[model samples]
Target: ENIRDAVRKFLTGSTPYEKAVDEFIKDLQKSLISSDVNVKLVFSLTAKIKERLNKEKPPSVLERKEWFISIVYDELSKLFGGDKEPNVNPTKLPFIIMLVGVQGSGKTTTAGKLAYFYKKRGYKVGLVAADVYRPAAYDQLLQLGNQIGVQVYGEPNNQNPIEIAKKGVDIFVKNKMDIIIVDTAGRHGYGEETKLLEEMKEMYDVLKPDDVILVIDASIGQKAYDLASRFHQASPIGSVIITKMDGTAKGGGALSAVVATGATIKFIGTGEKIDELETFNAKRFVSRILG
Candidate 1:
């Protein structure tokens, strides 16, 4: 909202159209950078906007303001993944999904939300608590499962996360579950990307989950690029989920960062509620941010 206000302020000013464009662009750059978007990306985006302004004249039938807004919308949409809408449909029955992310990225909460989402859709959803590093990840997931009326599998005393994950999936499969979600440790502590990715890869090899989701906090802003990109390379079938979108001024930066990594953002956490998750729609997202 604040980001959009910056641009809107320029549009409503008494400045001439050309000056308005320049001022609006500057405001946009400032807004994005302050919101923690990469400085390089902010400049690049403004450059493209300017390039189009220089090369393409507004259509004869349209007002200058309308044309300019349209151009902004177009570029912004591209920044948010263009027209791509992720296919959330399960590709196979009894599908397995593994969640990975840094600690406090809300990986556990998202696991519960996903279970609820699929369960509401009539799938027999199950939750697996494989996040052993975190103090109470198992307990947290269990509480969520109980609250959502979904079955949760966990080994509170067992320390082998991999074994627990494997057994959880096997048990759920034997029970004829439709979808099983495994929530894995985000990190052993932070700062060890190699080790984190290594752990994730080991689990991926063992479980061979149908989909690997990299959960992210929108508060990470531009940093999401490096993290998400590395995770994407480590898991070819991985998708992304951004949490805390409603709580961050840098949601734009986070989305741009994920898009920059060539990863798909399947869902976004809108609030703390279990049902607050929504599928990410590029065009609708762009429109809302531009408001």
Candidate 2:
């Protein structure tokens, strides 16, 4: 719905066609900015689109719309990191993943999805319940493991998260697991969560996680951009996972984080369903938005 709303608002408009396009770009630029897209990104992208339009030598009338759409689509894809995929080498047993985000930012749900994703690929996946802050977070992951038929390694409630992580790796290694995804606890927001991120990074140093994904909420918009900068200031982020992308809210802030951090968005969660997760594709996204 958000995609269509963004697309249709630009596509279906009054005014002469070329004039309508000028108007549409203005509104689309506003939409992206409202969604939390960074200001520098907004200006650069709009400029490129405008330049392309102005440089087009007079086109055959029948092919005008298609020609313009193609330019937009190509540039949009380039802007969004087209064709980039998560790099998981899958070499050693128990390739570890450390997931971080703020509380209620869908950390646990994303953990389950990652487990489901790896497990279905015939890899023996293990989940670590390192989220000691959230009550019942361990049990929550255990329940998800049960539903998805994957193995989860954890200690009793109130155990230190570091202990849980170390022992979880041992257990998964002993069991010959091929991959491990550890779900860490998030603070309410950026400042409050400083210690949690530090702890996660310390664990990252210990475990040398193959991938460290920062799961962010799409609805936070521009506020989400600041959150990412805070996390990066504390620790290096390997990649990004943007959750709840199907919401009507613009993902401008999320995009801003990517632009600021220079990390690719690895996955996009479209809905609550485990399978609703998508591999990131900037081109497909542009097509979805521009069509």
Candidate 3:
């Protein structure tokens, strides 16, 4: 049921396009399900494909079977997210982006990488270390901030997250940093997604971030949708960055899952290196995943 292998078979098998389309649609569902895509999206995308099967005919450049396959391809990409690149360019300066997600889901490192991503683009960036529960989390952010040549504001002795966050943003604004990214607590003490959203609400009220970026680990697989949807329920997500794209095959499922939530995927963290982050383009991403 692997997507790449399933696609290979769908493309090369002897069955005629008309004959195959009739049978192959079922395989597409299984292929995606095994690859980490949620069942919700499977039915949604598959139904759309079925609707197309009822409506369209082959184009001049393709045989009917091949033409049908083309429709599947286009619809598949749209299902994955869209056939467009994410908007990474900031519309205005002096913006605030609060990073949110589960614990051990790459939020901290992603914070560092995001700072570097914007810094390299000529924005005056700063980082706020607000993950008070993680031991030495402040020092870790400070070290990354120093390495990137951007200052980090943190209250290492203070355990009150809201207080620490408020001060950090105040300092950065005083320093006139163009982009302030606040790295908040992960799911450290929270029981699950709902509890995490409860914790997130406080930060959203206080920070009023210009953009709230949900940082997720690619390894969590299909559960990405749960985090994405519930997070949206707490506060709208400006964009999402799935980390560890280099470490997991379930990344395809995670990508599909997040897209189902209707939030734009902005970046993917590819490696441990600070500069390894890259903007996500669903069109290019689908090609990479298929091949």
Provide backbone clash counts, one per model: 0, 4, 1
The candidate 3 region of ten consecutive residues with least summed lDDT is 186-195
1 or 2: which has the higher TM-score?
1
Better-scoring candidate (TM-score), 2 or 3 = 2
C-alpha RMSD between model 2 and the true structure: 2.8
Give the higher-lDDT candidate: 1 or 2.
1
Best by lDDT: 1
Q: Which residue runs does candidate 3 get wrong by more than 4 Å?
A: 5-15, 18-27, 63-66, 83-86, 190-192
| Residue clash pairs of candidate 3 | 17-65
lDDT of 1 by residue, 185-283 (tens): 835654756667888899998999999998999998888898899988877678999999999888888989999989999999998889988888988
**What would the per-residue lDDT of candidate 2 be over residues 1-291, giving only the tens digit for each residue?**
244564565455545677767766777677677777777787888899889888876457655555666777777677777556556456676688889887877888899998888877788888988887787788888988899988777776655777788788878878888888988764444565676577767888787778888888888775666667666666564677888887746575675556456666778888888777777887776777665
Superposed model 1: Cα runs more than 4 Å off: 10-13
Task: Return the lDDT, model 2, position 163.
Answer: 76
lDDT of each: 0.88, 0.75, 0.81
Cα deviation at 74, candidate 2, in Å, is: 2.0
The predicted structure with the larger TM-score, 1 or 3, is 1
